[PDB]
Design a protein around this ligand. Sequence first.
Ligand SMILES: OC[C@H]1O[C@H](O[C@H]2[C@H](O)[C@@H](O)[C@@H](O[C@H]3[C@H](O)[C@@H](O)[C@@H](O[C@H]4[C@H](O)[C@@H](O)[C@@H](O[C@H]5[C@H](O)[C@@H](O)[C@@H](O)O[C@@H]5CO)O[C@@H]4CO)O[C@@H]3CO)O[C@@H]2CO)[C@H](O)[C@@H](O)[C@@H]1O
Ligand SMILES: OC[C@H]1O[C@H](O[C@H]2[C@H](O)[C@@H](O)[C@@H](O[C@H]3[C@H](O)[C@@H](O)[C@@H](O)O[C@@H]3CO)O[C@@H]2CO)[C@H](O)[C@@H](O)[C@@H]1O
Ligand SMILES: OC[C@H]1O[C@H](O[C@H]2[C@H](O)[C@@H](O)[C@@H](O)O[C@@H]2CO)[C@H](O)[C@@H](O)[C@@H]1O
Ligand SMILES: [Ca+2]
Ligand SMILES: [Ca+2]
Length: 686
Amino acid sequence: APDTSVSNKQNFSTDVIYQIFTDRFSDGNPANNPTGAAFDGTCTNLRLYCGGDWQGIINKINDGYLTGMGVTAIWISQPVENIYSIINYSGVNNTAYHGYWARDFKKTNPAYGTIADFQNLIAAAHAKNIKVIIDFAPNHTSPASSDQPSFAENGRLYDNGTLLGGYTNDTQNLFHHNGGTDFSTTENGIYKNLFDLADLNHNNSTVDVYLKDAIKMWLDLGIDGIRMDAVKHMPFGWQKSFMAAVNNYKPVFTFGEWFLGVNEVSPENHKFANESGMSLLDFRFAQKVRQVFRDNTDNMYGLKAMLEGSAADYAQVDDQVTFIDNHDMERFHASNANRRKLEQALAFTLTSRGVPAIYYGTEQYMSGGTDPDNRARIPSFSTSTTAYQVIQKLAPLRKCNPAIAYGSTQERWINNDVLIYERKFGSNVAVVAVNRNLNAPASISGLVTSLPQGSYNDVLGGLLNGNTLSVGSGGAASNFTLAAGGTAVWQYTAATATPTIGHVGPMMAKPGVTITIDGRGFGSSKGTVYFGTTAVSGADITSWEDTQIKVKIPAVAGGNYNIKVANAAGTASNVYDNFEVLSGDQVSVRFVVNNATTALGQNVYLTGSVSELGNWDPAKAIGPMYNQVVYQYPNWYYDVSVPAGKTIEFKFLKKQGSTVTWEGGSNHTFTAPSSGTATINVNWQP
Ligand SMILES: OC[C@H]1O[C@H](O[C@H]2[C@H](O)[C@@H](O)[C@@H](O[C@H]3[C@H](O)[C@@H](O)[C@@H](O[C@H]4[C@H](O)[C@@H](O)[C@@H](O[C@H]5[C@H](O)[C@@H](O)[C@@H](O)O[C@@H]5CO)O[C@@H]4CO)O[C@@H]3CO)O[C@@H]2CO)[C@H](O)[C@@H](O)[C@@H]1O
Ligand SMILES: OC[C@H]1O[C@H](O[C@H]2[C@H](O)[C@@H](O)[C@@H](O[C@H]3[C@H](O)[C@@H](O)[C@@H](O)O[C@@H]3CO)O[C@@H]2CO)[C@H](O)[C@@H](O)[C@@H]1O
Ligand SMILES: OC[C@H]1O[C@H](O[C@H]2[C@H](O)[C@@H](O)[C@@H](O)O[C@@H]2CO)[C@H](O)[C@@H](O)[C@@H]1O
Ligand SMILES: [Ca+2]
Ligand SMILES: [Ca+2]
C-alpha cells in the first residue's frame, strides 16, 4: 500500500487524530451503562459515568460524523478494566469514567464494552479507513492508601482475574512506597506516587513481564497506535525496553505524554523523544499556540521561534503529536471569546508539522475549565459549524500534499500579528497565511514563495476570509491585503522525480524486523536500501513502491545508523538519520554504584561494551544517574535497557561538563537476564 493507507501503523503524519473521551462521546448501548450512585445519564455530574461506549463510537463512524470531518484516526480512553469503587474525595463522588484507574490490563472496561465490542470497533474503523489508537497507563493502577486498605480498591492489580497484589501489605514489592511526588525533580516524579495513585514498580520482574504481556494482547487485537500516559513519571530505561518489546513484536506508532507548562522547555524531554523509541505529545507547540492565539501573551515572533527551535531539538519533529487542548487543560474556546480564534488555531495546527490531534467537541465550540469541566458530553453532532468545515477542508490535505505531512517549515513573512509560512517536500508546496489580528488588516508585500508562477485559490474557499494569491516570476507574490482575522491556504503538488524519504518507523529495533520507509519518487522497481554503508536488496526488501518501501533490518552491529535509498536506476535519496539498531531483545536492568563521591555539578554515568551502553564513548554515557529516592548519595542508581542474555562489560564515570573521570581497576562484568529484570550492585573503584 501507499504511505497514506489505513494499513500503515508506522506513520500517522498524514493522518488527523480525533481524541475521544469514550464516556462522553456516545452511548450506543445503554445496556452496559453502570448503575446506582455511579451513574448519571444526564451527564450533569461530570465525575460519574455518563454512558459513553464503543458501540457509540461505531455508530458515529457509520453515520458519517467522523468521516465527513476528514478524521482518519481516533484516540480512545484506556480500554482496560478499571476499579469499580466510587471514590469519595471530600464529599465528592468520583468514578473511573476516564479509564485511568486500572485494575486489570488483560481485561476490558465493562462500561465500554466486551472484547467482541472492541473487535467490532476496530473492524468498523478499519472499514472506514480510520486508525485506532488506545491510551495506555502502565505507570500506576488506582488511588490507594497503604494504611486504609478499605479505601478504594487498594490499587489492587489483577492478572486476567487473578489477584496479583494490593498497595497494603505489599510483600512482593509490586509498588513504590516513597510517598507522592512534589514535582520537584525528575527523579522525584518517577519513583514517587502520582497524586495518590499506586505507583508500579517496573523493577519488579512480575510487573515487567506482566506489562509486556498485556500490551501484546492489545497488539494482537489490531490496535494501530498507542498513547503512553505519564511517561514523565516512568523510568526512561524501562520505557525503552518496553518500546523494544513492541517494535520487535508488532510495531505501532507510539507517543507518550510528557507534560510541559507554559514557556517550559525541557532537554530531558527532547532526549526522551529522540532516544526512547517513542515520540511525544507536542506540549511546547500547544502551549505556544495558546499563548499566541488564545491568551495573547506572546506574538508571531514567539510562534516562529517555537517552530525553528523545535525543528532542531527533535530528531523526528514530524512524529510529535500536536494539539491546542486536551482533557487536562481549559478548553481552547472561551464562552465569551471570538470563535475565529479557535478556527485559526485549528487551521494552523492542521497545516503544521507533526501529528495533529483534535480533542472531541472542539468542532462544536465546547467551552470549559479544568477537569472535569473540560469533559462534558458532546452537545451535538452538527456538521454545520465553521470549525467542522475547516477540518473538513484541511484534513485531507495531509493525505494529498506531502509538503504538509513531511515538508519542512519556513517563515516567509512575519510581523506582530501575521505569519506566512511555507511547507516544502520535494515538488510539493503549501503556503499558509495567518492574521491573528481580529481588528486590523495587513498589507502584504515582498512575499516570496516556492510556488510556481500562477494563480492560487484559497483552499479554505474564503471560509476564513482567505484570498486568491498571484504568483509571478521567481515565486514573487503580488501585493495583497490580508483581511483581519484572515487565514488562507495555497498549495502546489507535483510529481517527484528523485527518491525522497519523508518518514521512517519504527525508529528503533533489532535486526530481522521490517521497517517502513515512506516518501515519494521511489520508483516502481526494487532499488537498494542502505543502513549506513551496508546495502540491502532483493528478498529482504519485502515490498517496494513509489511512496513506500518495506525492508528487513540487516544483521549489523547494534548502533545508530543513517538510512538512504536508491532507485533501480542508481539514484540516491536524501538521508534519514537517527536510526537505532538494537543489539537484540531488551531487558530492564538496574545499575547501582556504591561510594561514588562527587562535587557539586559533578555527576556519575555508566558506560560499557554494547551500543545500548554507548560502546565506551563517554559522549554516549548513560546518565546522569540518580541518588535521591531509591538510593541516596554517595550511592547512585539507574534503570537501563540492555540486550537480554548478553555478557556485558561496564564501568562508571564521573562527568563535569565534557570532562570525564574514569573508574579505576578493571571492568565490571555481568550477564543480562533473558527475561524480566535484574539489579547490579557494585562499588566504585578508585
Ligand atoms: O533536579 C535534581 C538535581 O540534579 C542536579 O544535582 C546533582 C548534582 O549535579 C550532583 O553534583 C550531585 O550532588 C551531590 C554532590 O555531588 C555532593 O558533593 C553532595 O553535595 C553537598 C556539597 O558537597 C556540600 O558542600 C553542600 O553544598 C553547598 C555548597 O558547598 C555551597 O557552595 C552552596 O552551593 O551551598 C551548598 C549547600 O547545600 O551540600 C551538598 C549536599 O550535601 O551531595 C549532592 C547530592 O545530595 O547530585 C545532584 C542530584 O542529587 C542539579 O544540579 C540540581 O540543580 C538538581 O536539583
Ligand atoms: O577499542 C579498543 C579497546 O576497546 C576496549 O577498551 C575499553 C576499556 O575496556 C574500558 O575500560 C575503557 O577504558 C578506559 C579505562 O577503563 C580507564 O581506566 C582509562 O584508562 O581510560 C580508558 C578509556 O580511554 O574504554 C576502552 C575503550 O576506549 C576493549 O575493552 C579493549 O580490549 C580494546 O583494546
Ligand atoms: O522579500 C523577502 C523577505 O520577505 C519577508 O520579509 C517581510 C517581513 O517579514 C515583513 O515584516 C515586512 O517587513 O515585509 C518584508 C518583505 O518586504 C521575509 O521575512 C524575509 O526573510 C525575506 O527576505
Ligand atoms: Ca453504554
Ligand atoms: Ca512511577
